[PDB]
RNA sequence: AGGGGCGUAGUUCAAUUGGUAGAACACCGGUCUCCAAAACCGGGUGUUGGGAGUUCGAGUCUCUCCGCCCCUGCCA
RNA sequence: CCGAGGGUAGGGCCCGUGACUGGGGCGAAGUCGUAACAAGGUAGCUGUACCGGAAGGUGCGGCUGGA
RNA sequence: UGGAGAGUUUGAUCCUGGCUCAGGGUGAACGCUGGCGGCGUGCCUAAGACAUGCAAGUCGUGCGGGCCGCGGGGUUUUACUCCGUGGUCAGCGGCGGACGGGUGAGUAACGCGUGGGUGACCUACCCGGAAGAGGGGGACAACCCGGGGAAACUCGGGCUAAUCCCCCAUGUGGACCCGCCCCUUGGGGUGUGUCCAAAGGGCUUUGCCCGCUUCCGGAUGGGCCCGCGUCCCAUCAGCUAGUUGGUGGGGUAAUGGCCCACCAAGGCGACGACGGGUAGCCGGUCUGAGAGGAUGGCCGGCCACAGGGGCACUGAGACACGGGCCCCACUCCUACGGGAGGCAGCAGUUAGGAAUCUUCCGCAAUGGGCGCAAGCCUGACGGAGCGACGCCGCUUGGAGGAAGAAGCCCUUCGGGGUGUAAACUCCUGAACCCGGGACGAAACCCCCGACGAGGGGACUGACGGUACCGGGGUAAUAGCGCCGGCCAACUCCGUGCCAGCAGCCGCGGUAAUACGGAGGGCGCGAGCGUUACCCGGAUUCACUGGGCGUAAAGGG
């Protein structure tokens, strides 16, 4: 179930800095900022020209690890992302952004991704009226994500909701900071998502 | 230890006897009819074949022969008899046949 | 065509003993015919039953005889009182001796006696001698042989006089009567124990059967708590691992039971289980209660030669057999250093490693035998594995 | 004879019958002469009972005994109203 | 559950007058070699199935116990 | 009259099995030789025929995938 | 809107070619591990044998009784109990037990698929139409009595009722022979002769409701027949006497050698007859770029079977799963002369097996049979149970937290790694607790309106005190494979061609990223591996899409 374990252990390995912890992973010590190398006993020696396979693996893991989505879903959602008319490149990336908890994280609310999930698994999060608790819930157009009321007074929801004053949300989401709402104006775009991932490879890895 | 479907059996045997007789009749009564039809009894022949043609449609009333079954038995009778009486006969007293 | 069983009278089960042939088995037959008059309406241990107008009795008639000891034990390990049978011909017989020292090896409180084959060669001193022999023997094994009900009354006589007619009340037979003498010598003097029902559940398994059109049935002597139709249970002990099942049958002497309580020898039809999966020895308990183990330290006392046991003692590495609830599993013996010298009548503690998983729970006594002779008994202390 | 019954479709605890004309002898969920409608008994949607008047009526006019409850729905659909 | 068998080196087998248990071929160990095979020296390498009993001494003679084979057992 | 089945008798197909026997495949370090690969020490291969512990040899004809 | 290739023959190379791997799939089983839920799904083998209970009945508004509880004495009391009347046992009579449910044994075949034919037919109940329903007679049960009998039950005498049976009439019409006409395989009209109908039951009573009879038509469901399609062996090549056709018969709802006499000698076969093997067919399912290949379990349609086997009776329909007759084998009862059964219906047992579930609750819904109706029956069905068997959703926490505790492992003894991982700080609240708590159920039926239309009224929930909702609320499981190359992942020690690994190539003979353990890593996660089988890759049976001088392959 959703990994759970040494994550700023993958900020490493994938060698492409990751902030799955948020605050710290954002500090002068993303773990990455002290060891730009993979873990293990070796981790700092010549590296064989990674095979054509390896690259794709790493590209995929880069992405999948970047959400916490466990393979099964990851790869599953991928297939849906295939039949759907269009470029799998956009689509998929888009269908990865439609992930409730994700958006949660995408719209402040939670410092990081792994945290945004729990907010969902406890009710704290709410949609177009009625609340929801499935991290897999897929957001659709014109739907706002609101915090619950019992929470609004919680020490956490505060500080986290504060970091919004000043900072602007992604070009496909709004935000009633005082009224914790913000809608999902439209599926995000390749460019809007500045992710250290080369989707086109992650795609090739599922061909074989 | 049992079930009451036996009602259907006893019953079975009963009417299995009812048309068993109605049937054997039509037969023994059809034969004699023609068994004369070649002799030349004309009049008497059409007499029996007339009783024959009755007993056939009769059985046709219940679950014994029903429709066409009876109609066939008749056609062959009103056939054999006739086809016979033309071997020197001429249909006396208008029996069931119609010339 | 089955017919329920309904409670009224308390319940205490018992069985016969005494040297082979003497008088049991045939006598056991009698006791049934008798309490069958004015109630109710109308090689291998044989459970049967019968009830006095005062109490409910479950009767176990171990075939006796030598060779048949392991099987014998599991019998007097479940009965509250033994009917020591003796014939008014031969007297205190060897097996009558062995079916005695055992009783004291299993606790068995109080032992009613009974002189059988009475209608044979009268003799002044004899009938008054035999009864003297016995008691002189019961105290020879520390029993209340002096205050023991010694009824006389050759039972076959009772039987064949009840075979002519299945109906006869008390007094009407100078031969029946001599039966009720035992049916009142037992009714009285033989207590009625207290089986903890507040406790979980447990039931050693005696025999296992397969009732056609139903499945496997396991008969045993309830230990603690109780069990009614539809209760889950763990078959702890012996085999791969503790399997689980839902009791779907409980019957007392072939009569539907509603919730057999402790001290009730009932047959439990388990849901979805094969006769190969259920062995003797193992246990039926409350799911979560007890666990299979093979390494344990037990406080043991090794009998003295004069007390029956060994007379040469032993060292570490000796492999005797161990008796728990209803079976005999073998075990390797390992001593806590320097304890190497373990002689007779000594009292110490070491560790055993059984070659077969068994339901052990600390607080459970057992019994070490070997070469035909209880070498010593003890109790489970800490459990290693 | 030829009835106008309800055939059960949809998943467990989620029934969805299909108003249909079938020989009274067929399995209720087996092959049928002609569907003329559906009915969601739990509504869960504005449209939970549509029927095909033109056909419902035709069958009734050639001998198609409806079900106690099947009839109730043709009724509610407005098949027997004559004005 | 109860009877009766059967269990010795690595295998097939000999000692059953109660007396450290050998016989053959194997394998093991050295030497030569990379390492073997071969050759040459050198070796019983065994839980006598376990554990106890009697006995001065048990493969043998008692009992019990493990596995296996055979026979008879076994409806709450 | 027909007729399930039973009975006598004799055929066909297939399967299992049989003292003994034929060759076959496989199997670290057995025995005999030396046919072939370099005119492989008699160019090789070949159909057939006779012969020989064994490879094989010789006859007749053929091939070059030999000089 | 759709196609990826790698390892392996050599000192090396190119080609040919086989083997092998990476991808999906499954009614799965086996290993380690296993928390929740939903939806699916679960004897693939012995079509082996089966305890026990239940799987089909219902109408008294068809008819006469038995018996019991009650109008309450028939006369005046227990005389002729006539009957009032709700019931309950069986009989009579009707409709249903031929559908639903099970299984895949048989079958290579018009069995199935697909398209048609029937001037060669049938169809209970249900619609629309026409015409009827007049007289009469009679039996057998039930019951009374007698008899044999272990029983299952049976024989005999005699009452009695009907919508049971039969006779006459009626003849809208229908059936049949012969004639005529239309039409064309037996269809439609017509004339003379002959032949054929029928039942009453309840009411709220010259009228309704339910029945009945005859014909015509509608529906639906069928029978039969025909073209094309439908596996392996040709080391199987010839097969055929009811055989192929005819005529006249019997038979049937109907065609037909389906069956029968008589007659004629035919029919079929390399376009694969006959025979042997295997197998139920299909919609579809898996795989594939596609063409194909494989398959036919769940669900849906058709077929066939009901311990093995033969036959018929009733009937609209069966040669009949829980009907019958008989043989057989097996198992059981027996008062030894005769009786009994057939889970491939649902649960369950045992056997076989690598392996496949509860003797569950409810007719509340849907569907069915019978009833005017109330309603009764219904292991069809609606649910519940068990099993990670599969899919899908969810959990084991989140945010802080050290140039970095300990322990374990490496080390060029500086240190490096496991690792923000822990500890530690706050923060949320799976479970559990208390309260509340469904939808699925609206008509049958009743009342106003005519028992029509339309409006209103009442009863009814197995799953369940479940889902779900409100409040309260504890940091709360992790495993399995792999890390030489293919293929993501490397070091130390142990061992020393041993022990062992191994899908292919191959690893081990004293410095082994390959054996075994550890640290570390990679992958996937309530799972993860393994075995078996199908497709792919395999343009490796090549239609799409290959070949034959020397690689297999040109026939003398
Ligand atoms: C013994 C077999 C199975 C036991 C099973 C279990 O035992 C128990 O664990 C039991 C718990 C205490 C147990 O451990 N039993 C295990 C033991 C228990 C021992 C207890 C009590 C004693 O006390 C020291 C007790 C007998 C004591 O001995 C004395 C007798 C001495 C006799 C000497 C022999 C003499 C003359 C003789 O002629 C003789 C002979 O008899 C046999 C052979 N050849 C002879 O020549 C006296 O009678 C005393 O009373 C439980 O009861 C369990 O529930 C169980 C029944 C399952
Ligand atoms: N006359 C008589 N015979 C008896 C009596 N008890 C037993 N028997 C007979 O003697 C033998 C007893 O053996 P059994 O009943 O088996 O006793 P068990 O062997 O001790 O169980 C049998 O033959 C019995 O019939 C008795 O009291 N009187």
String of DSSP letters for chain A = ----S--TTTTTTS-S---SSSTGGGSTT-STTT--S--SS--SS------HHHHHHHHHHHHHHTT---HHHHHHHHHHHHHSSS-HHHHHHHHHHTBHHHHHHHSSSSSSHHHHHHHHTTS-EEESSSB---TT-B--TT-BEEE-HHHHTSHHHHHHHHTTSSPPPPTT----GGG---B--S---TTTS--S--HHHHHHTTT-
Q: Which nucleotide is closest, CA of C369 to its C1'? A: E64
Pairing label, strands C82-87, C111-116: parallel
CATH class of residue range B1-99: mainly alpha
C197 is in an annotated binding site: no
CB B58 within 8 A of CB B8: no
The protein residue whose alpha carbon is closest to atom 1 in ligand 1 is: C105
Residues with CB under 6 A from ligand 2: C 20-26, 116-117, 119, 154-157
CB A145 within 8 A of CB A139: yes
Q: How far apart are CA A31 and CA A25, in angstroms?
A: 7
Q: What is the DSSP letter of C365?
A: B
Cis ω for the linkage preceding C40 (within 30 of 0): yes
Which residue's C-alpha is at the least distance from the C1' of E66?
C330
Q: DSSP assignment of C90-108, as one string?
A: T-S-HHHHHHHHHHHHS--
Q: What is the DSSP letter of C47?
A: B
Q: How far apart are CA A108 and CA B90, in angstroms?
A: 118
- Per-domain residue ranges of chain B: 1-99
SS3 C293: strand
Q: How far apart are CA A208 and CA C333, in angstroms?
A: 60
Q: Which residues contact A86 (CB under 8 A, 6 or more apart)?
A: none
Is the shortest CB-to-strand distance from A127 to strand G under 7 Å? Answer: no
Range of the domain at D50: 1-83
Number of domains in chain D: 1
Protein-covered nucleotides of chain E (CB closer than 7 Å) are: 1-3, 50-54, 62-66, 73-76
Q: Hey, what are C70's tokens?
A: 């392991």
The chains found to touch B (3+ Cβ pairs under 8 angstroms) are none
* Helix axes A52-65 and A71-83, enclosed angle (nearest 10): 100
For residues A79, A84, A88, A94, the Cα torsion angle rounded to the nearest 10 degrees is -100
Core vs surface per residue A41-77: b (16+ CB within 10 A) or e: eeeeeeeeeeeeeeebebbbbbbbbbbbbeeebbeeb
Q: Which residues contact C71 (CB under 8 A, 6 or more apart)?
A: C44, C45, C62, C63
Identify whether A203 is part of a domain: yes
Q: What is the DSSP letter of C146?
A: G
- Rounded to the nearest 5°, which phi and psi values hold at C35? -70, 25
Number of domains in chain A: 2
Look at residues C99, C44, C102 and name the one whose alpha carbon lies nearest to residue C280. C44
The structure was resolved experimentally with: X-ray
Do A167 and A128 reside in the same domain of the chain?
yes
Range C254-259 contact pairs with CB under 8 angstroms and sequence separation of 24 or more: C255/C2, C255/C3, C255/C4, C255/C5, C256/C2, C256/C3, C256/C4, C256/C5, C257/C5, C258/C4, C258/C5, C258/C7, C258/C228, C259/C226, C259/C227, C259/C228
Catalytic residue, candidates C54, C65, C199, C304 = C65
Do A151 and A124 reside in the same domain of the chain?
yes
The count of other CB atoms within 10 Å of the CB of residue D71 is 15
D47 Rama class: left (phi>0) / alpha (psi -120 to 50) / beta: beta
CB A126 within 8 A of CB A146: yes
A30 is in an annotated binding site: yes
Look at residues A176, A83, A84, A76 and name the one whose alpha carbon lies nearest to residue A99. A76
The protein residue whose alpha carbon is closest to atom 18 in ligand 2 is: C21
Q: How far apart are CA C37 and CA C249, in angstroms?
A: 30
Q: How far apart are CA C232 and CA C191, in angstroms?
A: 33
- CA C23–ligand 2 middle distance (angstroms): 5
Distances from the Cα of C259 to the Cαs of C209, C225, C274, in angstroms? 20, 10, 24
Q: Does the Cβ of C323 fall within 6 Å of ligand 1?
A: yes
CB C78 within 8 A of CB C265: yes
- CA C49–ligand 2 middle distance (angstroms): 19
Q: Give resolution in angstroms.
A: 3.1
Q: Which residues contact B20 (CB under 8 A, 6 or more apart)?
A: none
Q: Which residues contact A163 (CB under 8 A, 6 or more apart)?
A: A108
Protein-covered nucleotides of chain G (CB closer than 7 Å) are: 4, 22-23, 38-40, 50-52, 56-58, 91-97, 99-101, 121-127, 153, 165-167, 174-178, 191-198, 213-215, 218-221, 249-254, 299-302, 313-317, 320, 322-324, 347-351, 357-359, 365-369, 380-384, 386, 392-404, 409-410, 416-421, 426-430, 439-444, 452-454, 471-472, 475, 477-478, 486-491, 519-526, 528
Range of the domain at A160: 97-184
Q: How far apart are CA C74 and CA C158, in angstroms?
A: 29
Specify the DSSP element, H or E, that contains D3: strand D2-9
CB D7 within 8 A of CB D37: no
Identify whether A2 is part of a domain: no
Q: How far apart are CA A120 and CA C119, in angstroms?
A: 91
Q: How far apart are CA A22 and CA A68, in angstroms?
A: 14
Do A46 and A17 reside in the same domain of the chain?
yes
Residue C82 burial class via C-beta count within 10 angstroms: exposed 0-12, middle 13-18, buried 19 and up: buried
Return the CATH number at A199.
1.10.1050.10
Is the shortest CB-to-strand distance from D45 to strand G under 7 Å? Answer: no
Q: Hey, what are C39's tokens?
A: 């109630």
- CA C61–ligand 1 middle distance (angstroms): 21
Q: Does the Cβ of C141 fall within 6 Å of ligand 1?
A: yes
Q: Hey, what are C215's tokens?
A: 């499945």
Q: Hey, what are A97's tokens?
A: 């952004």
Q: What is the DSSP letter of C145?
A: G
Q: In what order do the strands lie in the sheet with D2-9?
A: D2-9, D16-23, D34-39, D49-51
- Rounded to the nearest 5°, which phi and psi values hold at C130? -50, -55
Range A8-14 contact pairs with CB under 8 angstroms and sequence separation of 24 or more: A8/A32, A9/A39, A10/A61, A10/A65, A12/A36, A12/A37, A12/A38, A12/A39, A13/A38, A13/A39, A14/A58, A14/A61, A14/A62, A14/A65
- CA A198–ligand 2 middle distance (angstroms): 97
CB A161 within 8 A of CB A170: no
Q: How far apart are CA C42 and CA A145, in angstroms?
A: 81
Q: How far apart are CA C263 and CA C57, in angstroms?
A: 11
Is the shortest CB-to-strand distance from A51 to strand G under 7 Å? Answer: yes
Q: How far apart are CA A118 and CA A120, in angstroms?
A: 5
Q: How far apart are CA A119 and CA A101, in angstroms?
A: 8
A25 is in an annotated binding site: yes
SS3 C217: strand
The count of other CB atoms within 10 Å of the CB of residue B57 is 13
Q: How far apart are CA D26 and CA D80, in angstroms?
A: 26
Q: Hey, what are C376's tokens?
A: 């010593």
The chains found to touch C (3+ Cβ pairs under 8 angstroms) are none
CB D11 within 8 A of CB D2: no
Core vs surface per residue A131-170: b (16+ CB within 10 A) or e: ebeebebebeeeebbbbbeebeeeeebeebbeebeeeeeb
Is the shortest CB-to-strand distance from A129 to strand G under 7 Å? Answer: no
Look at residues A36, A37, A43, A11 and name the one whose alpha carbon lies nearest to residue A24. A11
Return the CATH number at D31.
3.30.1320.10
Q: How far apart are CA A203 and CA A206, in angstroms?
A: 6
Catalytic residue, candidates C11, C16, C24, C168 = C24
The protein residue whose alpha carbon is closest to atom 39 in ligand 1 is: C308
Q: Does the Cβ of C310 fall within 6 Å of ligand 1?
A: no
Q: Hey, what are A182's tokens?
A: 């913000």
For residues A60, A63, A67, A71, the Cα torsion angle rounded to the nearest 10 degrees is -10
Return the CATH number at A160.
3.10.290.10
Q: DSSP assignment of D28-80, as one string?
A: TTS--SEEEEEE-TT--SS--EEE-HHHHHHHHTT--PBPHHHHHHHHHHSSS
Closest-approaching ligand to the CA atom of C100? 1
CB A181 within 8 A of CB A146: yes
Say how far residue B19 (Cα) sits from the centre of its chain.
Answer: 12
């Amino acid at each position: 179930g959703r990994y759970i374990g040494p994550v700023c252990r993958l900020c490493r390995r994938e060698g492409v800095k990751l902030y799955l912890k948020g605050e710290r992973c954002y500090s002068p010590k993303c773990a990455m900022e002290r060891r730009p190398y993979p873990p293990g006993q070796h981790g700092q020696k010549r590296a064989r020209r990674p095979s054509d396979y390896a690259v794709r693996l790493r590209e995929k893991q880069k992405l999948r690890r970047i959400y916490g989505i466990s393979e099964r879903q990851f790869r599953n959602l991928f297939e849906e992302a295939s039949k759907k008319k269009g470029v799998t490149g956009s689509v998929f990336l888009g269908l990865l952004e439609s992930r409730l908890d994700n958006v949660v994280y995408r719209l402040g609310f939670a410092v990081s991704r792994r945290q945004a999930r729990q907010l969902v698994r406890h009710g704290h999060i709410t949609v177009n009226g009625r609340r929801v608790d499935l991290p897999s819930y897929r957001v659709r157009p014109g739907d706002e994500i609101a915090v619950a009321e019992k929470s609004r007074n919680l020490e956490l929801i505060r500080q986290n909701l504060e970091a919004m004053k000043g900072r602007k949300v992604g070009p496909w989401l709004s935000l009633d900071v005082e009224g914790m709402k913000g809608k999902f104006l439209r599926l995000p775009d390749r460019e809007d998502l500045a992710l250290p991932v080369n989707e086109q490879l992650v795609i090739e890895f599922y061909s074989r | 230890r049992n079930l009451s479907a036996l009602k259907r059996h006893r019953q079975s045997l009963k009417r299995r006897l009812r048309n068993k007789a109605k049937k054997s009749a039509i037969k023994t009564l059809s034969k004699k009819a023609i068994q004369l039809a070649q002799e030349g009894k004309a009049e008497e022949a059409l007499k029996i074949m007339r009783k024959a043609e009755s007993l056939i449609d009769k059985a046709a009333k219940g679950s014994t022969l029903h429709k066409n079954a009876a109609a066939r038995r008749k056609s062959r009778l009103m056939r054999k008899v006739r086809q016979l009486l033309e071997a020197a006969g001429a249909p006396l007293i208008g029996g069931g046949l119609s010339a | 065509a089955k017919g329920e069983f309904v409670r009224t009278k308390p319940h205490v089960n018992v069985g016969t003993i005494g040297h082979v042939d003497h008088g049991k088995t045939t006598l056991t037959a009698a006791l049934t015919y008798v309490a069958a008059a004015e109630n109710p309406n109308v090689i291998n241990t044989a459970h049967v039953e019968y009830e006095t107008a005062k109490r409910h009795y479950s009767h176990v008639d171990c075939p006796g005889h030598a060779d048949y000891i392991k099987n014998m034990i599991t019998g007097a390990a479940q009965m509250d009182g033994a009917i020591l049978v003796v014939s008014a011909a031969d007297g205190p017989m060897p097996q009558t001796r062995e079916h005695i020292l055992l009783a004291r090896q299993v606790g068995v409180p109080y032992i009613v006696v009974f002189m059988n084959k009475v209608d044979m060669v009268d003799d002044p001193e004899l009938l008054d001698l035999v009864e003297m022999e016995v008691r002189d023997l019961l105290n020879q094994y520390e029993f209340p042989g002096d205050e023991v009900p010694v009824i006389r009354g050759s039972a076959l006589l009772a039987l064949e006089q009840m075979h002519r007619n299945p109906k006869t009340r008390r007094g009407e037979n100078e031969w029946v009567d001599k039966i009720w003498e035992l049916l009142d010598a037992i009714d009285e003097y033989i207590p009625t124990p207290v089986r903890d029902v507040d406790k979980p559940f447990l039931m050693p398994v005696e025999d296992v059967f397969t009732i056609t059109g139903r499945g496997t049935v396991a008969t045993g002597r309830i230990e603690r708590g109780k069990v009614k139709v539809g209760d889950e249970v763990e078959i702890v002990g012996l085999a791969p691992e503790t399997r689980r099942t839902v009791v779907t049958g409980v019957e007392m002497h072939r009569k539907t039971l509603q919730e057999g309580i402790a001290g009730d020898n009932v047959g439990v039809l388990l849901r979805g289980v094969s006769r190969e999966e259920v062995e003797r020895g193992q246990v039926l308990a409350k799911p979560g209660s007890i666990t299979p183990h093979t390494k344990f330290e037990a406080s043991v006392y090794v009998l003295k030669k004069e007390e029956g046991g060994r007379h040469t003692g032993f060292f570490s590495g000796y492999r005797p057999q161990f008796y728990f609830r209803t079976t005999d599993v073998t075990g390797v013996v390992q001593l806590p250093p320097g304890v190497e010298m373990v002689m007779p009548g000594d009292n110490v503690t070491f560790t055993v490693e059984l070659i077969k998983p068994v339901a052990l729970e600390e607080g459970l006594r057992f019994a070490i035998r070997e070469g035909g002779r209880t070498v010593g008994a003890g109790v489970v202390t800490k459990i290693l594995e | 004879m030829v009835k106008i019954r309800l055939a059960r479709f949809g998943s467990k605890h989620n029934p969805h019958y299909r108003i249909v004309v079938t020989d009274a002898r067929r399995k209720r969920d087996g092959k049928y002469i002609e569907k003329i409608g559906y009915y969601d008994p739990r509504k869960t949607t504005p449209d939970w009972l549509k029927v095909d008047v033109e056909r419902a009526r035709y069958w009734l006019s050639v001998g198609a005994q409806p079900t106690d409850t099947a009839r109730r729905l043709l009724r509610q659909a407005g098949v027997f109203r004559q004005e």
